[PDB]
Amino acid sequence: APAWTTFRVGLFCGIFIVLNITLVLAAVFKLETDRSIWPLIRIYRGGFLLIEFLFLLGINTYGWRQAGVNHVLIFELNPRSNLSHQHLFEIAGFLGILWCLSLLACFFAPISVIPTYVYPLALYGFMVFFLINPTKTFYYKSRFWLLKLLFRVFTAPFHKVGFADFWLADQLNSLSVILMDLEYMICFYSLELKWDESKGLLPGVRAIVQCIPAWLRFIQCLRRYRDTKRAFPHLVNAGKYSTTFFMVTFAALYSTHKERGHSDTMVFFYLWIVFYIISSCYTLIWDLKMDWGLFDKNAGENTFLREEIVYPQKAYYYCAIIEDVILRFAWTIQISITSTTLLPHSGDIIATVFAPLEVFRRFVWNFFRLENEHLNNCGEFR
Amino acid sequence: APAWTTFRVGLFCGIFIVLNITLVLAAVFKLETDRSIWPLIRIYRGGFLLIEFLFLLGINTYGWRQAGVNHVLIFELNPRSNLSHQHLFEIAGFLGILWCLSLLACFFAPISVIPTYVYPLALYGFMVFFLINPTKTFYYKSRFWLLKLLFRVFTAPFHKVGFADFWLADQLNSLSVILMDLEYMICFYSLELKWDESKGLLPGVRAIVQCIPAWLRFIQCLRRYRDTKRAFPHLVNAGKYSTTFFMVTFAALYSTHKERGHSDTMVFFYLWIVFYIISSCYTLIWDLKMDWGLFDKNAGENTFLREEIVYPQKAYYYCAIIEDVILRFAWTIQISITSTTLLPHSGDIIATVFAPLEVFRRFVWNFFRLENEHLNNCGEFR
Ligand SMILES: CCCCCCCCCCCCCCCCCC(=O)OC[C@H](COP(=O)([O-])OCC[N+](C)(C)C)OC(=O)CCCCCCCCCCCCCCCCC
Ligand SMILES: CCCCCCCCCCCCCCCCCC(=O)OC[C@H](COP(=O)([O-])OCC[N+](C)(C)C)OC(=O)CCCCCCCCCCCCCCCCC
Ligand SMILES: CCCCCCCCCCCCCCCCCC(=O)OC[C@H](COP(=O)([O-])OCC[N+](C)(C)C)OC(=O)CCCCCCCCCCCCCCCCC
Ligand SMILES: CCCCCCCCCCCCCCCCCC(=O)OC[C@H](COP(=O)([O-])OCC[N+](C)(C)C)OC(=O)CCCCCCCCCCCCCCCCC
Numbered sequence: 001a002p003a004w005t006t007f008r009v010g011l012f013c014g015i016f017i018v019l020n021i022t023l024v025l026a027a028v029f030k031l032e033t034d035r036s037i038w039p040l041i042r043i044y045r046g047g048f049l050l051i052e053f054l055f056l057l058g059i060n061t062y063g064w065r066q067a068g069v070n071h072v073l074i075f076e077l078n079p080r081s082n083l084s085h086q087h088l089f090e091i092a093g094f095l096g097i098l099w100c101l102s103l104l105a106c107f108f109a110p111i112s113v114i115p116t117y118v119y120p121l122a123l124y125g126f127m128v129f130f131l132i133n134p135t136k137t138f139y140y141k142s143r144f145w146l147l148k149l150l151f152r153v154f155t156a157p158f159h160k161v162g163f164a165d166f167w168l169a170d171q172l173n174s175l176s177v178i179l180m181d182l183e184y185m186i187c188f189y190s191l192e193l194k195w196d197e198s199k200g201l202l203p204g205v206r207a208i209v210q211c212i213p214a215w216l217r218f219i220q221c222l223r224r225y226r227d228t229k230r231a232f233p234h235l236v237n238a239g240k241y242s243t244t245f246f247m248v249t250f251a252a253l254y255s256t257h258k259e260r261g262h263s264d265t266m267v268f269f270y271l272w273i274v275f276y277i278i279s280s281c282y283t284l285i286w287d288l289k290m291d292w293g294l295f296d297k298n299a300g301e302n303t304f305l306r307e308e309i310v311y312p313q314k315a316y317y318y319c320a321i322i323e324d325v326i327l328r329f330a331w332t333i334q335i336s337i338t339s340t341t342l343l344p345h346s347g348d349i350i351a352t353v354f355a356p357l358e359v360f361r362r363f364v365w366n367f368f369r370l371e372n373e374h375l376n377n378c379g380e381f382r
Numbered sequence: 383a384p385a386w387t388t389f390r391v392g393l394f395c396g397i398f399i400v401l402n403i404t405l406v407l408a409a410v411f412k413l414e415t416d417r418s419i420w421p422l423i424r425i426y427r428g429g430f431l432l433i434e435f436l437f438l439l440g441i442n443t444y445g446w447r448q449a450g451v452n453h454v455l456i457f458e459l460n461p462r463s464n465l466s467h468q469h470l471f472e473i474a475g476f477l478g479i480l481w482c483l484s485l486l487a488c489f490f491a492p493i494s495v496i497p498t499y500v501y502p503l504a505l506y507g508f509m510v511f512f513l514i515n516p517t518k519t520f521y522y523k524s525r526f527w528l529l530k531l532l533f534r535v536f537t538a539p540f541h542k543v544g545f546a547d548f549w550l551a552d553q554l555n556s557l558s559v560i561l562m563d564l565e566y567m568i569c570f571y572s573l574e575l576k577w578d579e580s581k582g583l584l585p586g587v588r589a590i591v592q593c594i595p596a597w598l599r600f601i602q603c604l605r606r607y608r609d610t611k612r613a614f615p616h617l618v619n620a621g622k623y624s625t626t627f628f629m630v631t632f633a634a635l636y637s638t639h640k641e642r643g644h645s646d647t648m649v650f651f652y653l654w655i656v657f658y659i660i661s662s663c664y665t666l667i668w669d670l671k672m673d674w675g676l677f678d679k680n681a682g683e684n685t686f687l688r689e690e691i692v693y694p695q696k697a698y699y700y701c702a703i704i705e706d707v708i709l710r711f712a713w714t715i716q717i718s719i720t721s722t723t724l725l726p727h728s729g730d731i732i733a734t735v736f737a738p739l740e741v742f743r744r745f746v747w748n749f750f751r752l753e754n755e756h757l758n759n760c761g762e763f764r
Binding site (some may be wrong): 001003006007008009010012013014015017018019022377 | 383385388389391392393394395396397399400401404536
């Protein structure tokens with residue numbers, strides 16, 4: 001990669017570090033004292049997750065470059081002009097600079113007129129303008145490819161399902177915090193926000209929104225079967241996402257009938273518990289045995305894993321498996337707490353702590369799924 | 383292709399940028415009108431100009447390797463272990479981060495311990511600690527080379543004379559102000575300071591030390607004459623540097639008699655004026671005729687330049703010449719004002735603005751003097 005790309009990577013990383021430190025210092029000592037900044041958090045976290053996601057994705061590319069598995073051919077990208085890890089770090093650093101500047105603007109509102117509202121709006125609007133921009137400024141091929149994929153994924157099962165479409169729809173299942181907080185921003189600006197004089201911060205459908213990343217995968221797998229006529233792995237995956245469907249549904253039912261009479265709420269709680277267990281076990285075993293391709297009985301050495309090991313040492317696998325076993329339950333409880341008022345106490349703190357763990361599990365799952373899709377060719381994309 | 387080194391260069395550049403922005407924003411946010419920044423800036427500009435010179439020298443090395451300058455053959459040096467512009471950039475950025483941290487700590491003073499006046503010394507000590515430390519690291523070879531040339535430069539003709547020591551001594555003329563800064567530090571830390579308060583302030587020897595960079599070159603020219611028994615240009619150069627002695631002498635006399643109010647005050651003024659004029663024109667013609675080797679007869683299509691320009695555009699040279707014809711005068715004016723007490727009003731801003739301009743003039747002067755030396759060997763170093 002050219003030296004100027006690395007220079008911009010370093011510049012953006014250093015600005016990111018300094019802005020992180022000054023955000024910590026500003027948020028710990030003198031920001032508002034008594035503000036209850038929690039709504040602000042919900043506005044920013046998902047966007048931050050995106051930055052984090054991109055950052056993590058860059059590392060993944062590095063691995064997929066150092067392992068050099070198939071990344072050019074699996075995603076069916078162009079054989080030339082493919083983004084490297086440094087380019088992902090560049091974009092992530094630019095977005096992090098914008099995010100930190102918006103956060104500092106929120107904490108230092110006297111920076112300009114039109115306080116508060118515009119800054120998160122400005123950040124996300126700038127991220128959208130960078131995304132959809134036919135001016136062909138910088139990496140226009142990448143942004144256009146992402147735009148084309150989003151239509152093929154976020155819309156419906158009408159489109160053909162490919163590896164890239166499946167991958168994006170799948171990792172939306174882990175960064176769906178942004179989808180939740182987008183509707184949260186809409187509602188908060190609509191109703192919760194004072195939005196009358198200045199600096200106003202006061203010192204049902206969400207269940208549907210939570211299932212959109214699950215609905216997309218369910219209908220994608222249904223389309224896969226409809227054009228496949230051979231549901232060896234497909235209906236299993238549909239059941240896997242229907243477990244999330246049921247867990248979200250009964251979480252919503254419990255949070256609705258807890259405070260509205262209906263003393264049979266203990267039945268809903270037991271159903272929630274059993275569906276939590278079922279979804280966690282289903283997703284975990286699907287990841288371990290058939291998604292990552294581990295636990296292969298044909299393997300002779302390096303038990304609990306498969307015959308062929310791309311990565312340098314088996315130590316990366318067992319720690320990852322333990323962390324994934326923890327983070328599967330983390331995600332399972334997260335997508336239930338963020339959906340509705342399951343836990344009146346805390347919850348938001350839990351959601352903010354747990355979301356980066358979901359993106360972390362995505363970061364390792366990308367490694368393992370991509371390195372699995374070189375020999376087994378799961379999903380038969382070929 | 384030092385990719386990680388380029389990354390570190392960018393990281394340090396970004397941290398320095400954000401720290402400088404924080405400095406400029408805290409200067410107009412914190413501090414009080416009755417607490418003038420003049421002591422703090424008179425302490426810190428010594429390191430500020432050092433960092434500026436180091437970064438400009440990195441640019442100088444980059445430009446030298448860009449087109450036609452070989453600052454290895456005639457620079458002493460080793461043709462296999464030279465410092466590149468990346469390394470100079472990294473060193474400048476590292477010292478800039480340390481300087482910015484020191485200045486910010488002096489601005490805020492988060493803790494009642496480690497008084498404000500302790501922060502600069504450590505940095506300067508750290509600067510010394512980057513050279514005197516014998517641990518073979520941090521480009522130990524270059525640090526040892528610098529400390530082995532700071533002896534051949536800062537001493538008397540007891541040593542020999544070459545290109546490297548002559549150049550290092552010449553840079554001292556542009557860096558004379560920081561020497562005064564060091565002097566000021568001592569005068570700050572010996573005579574006027576309230577050691578019982580953590581705040582940094584309260585709401586003829588200098589004229590001699592000012593000539594030290596001039597003496598180190600005058601006596602070195604005399605050494606060259608004693609060696610080669612060559613009248614021109616060694617004695618001409620000696621006169622050019624003794625013009626500094628004459629200028630400072632008459633400026634000091636005029637200022638001293640101005641405050642003392644004696645009848646011989648006005649007589650020295652015209653002598654100071656004429657010596658200023660002759661000194662400025664002397665250094666000017668030395669720069670534009672023998673330093674840079676311009677105004678050459680039968681040079682060719684080049685206007686006012688010599689036969690060989692090497693550098694891409696002719697316009698550069700003309701700009702340089704114009705800037706030189708300005709900056710030298712400012713430079714000479716600076717020598718008048720910083721040292722002697724003449725016209726205490728203003729001057730401080732004059733010094734703090736013209737000193738970086740002096741370093742910029744030295745930057746261009748390094749750009750062209752080494753070119754002249756490479757093209758037509760001057761100072762008889764062949
Ligand atoms: C070291 C002590 C202090 C540590 C402080 C930080 C610790 C906290 C944990 C950070 C983990 C960082 C891991 C990723 C970086 C290394 C990845 C890698 O493979 O690099 C090798 C890569 C590639 O290595 P390479 O180029 O040597 O490999 C090929 C070289 N040849 C061809 C010659 C063989 O390194 C680079 O040169 C790339 C650019 C620099 C490394 C990227 C750093 C970016 C840091 C961004 C941070 C902030 C932005 C986003 C943050 C968002 C989250 C909030
Ligand atoms: C409305 C809600 C929207 C929610 C989702 C928002 C977008 C989420 C995107 C997640 C994945 C992003 C990276 C995927 C591709 C990277 C992996 C890879 O190696 O592929 C190479 C690809 C292609 O790069 P390439 O250089 O290899 O190109 C290949 C060459 N062609 C195209 C000819 C085949 O890399 C990318 O596309 C990455 C660059 C784009 C990164 C995103 C830009 C900024 C993100 C802002 C998103 C908007 C947030 C919305 C906020 C609220 C809106 C109201
Ligand atoms: C007592 C008064 C002290 C006054 C000190 C004035 C400043 C001295 C340091 C600045 C001059 C150095 C740059 C000029 C030479 C560059 C030549 C070149 O291109 O080669 C690169 C040279 C060597 O290049 P190289 O290593 O690539 O070449 C190979 C060399 N040999 C032959 C040995 C293999 O390296 C440097 O100049 C960089 C070294 C770091 C310099 C800065 C260190 C930290 C700053 C502290 C300075 C002191 C501050 C004092 C403040 C007050 C203290 C009380
Ligand atoms: C944004 C505002 C710009 C103007 C503000 C005024 C300051 C000047 C800003 C920099 C102007 C250009 C300088 C570098 C010119 C190009 C050099 C080069 O080759 O770069 C390529 C290098 C990388 O090397 P490279 O190997 O890519 O070299 C390019 C040539 N090839 C590829 C063919 C070999 O890029 C950099 O890393 C440049 C660093 C940024 C510029 C300098 C800042 C860092 C060092 C100083 C830190 C701050 C302390 C001192 C600041 C001043 C006093 C307070």
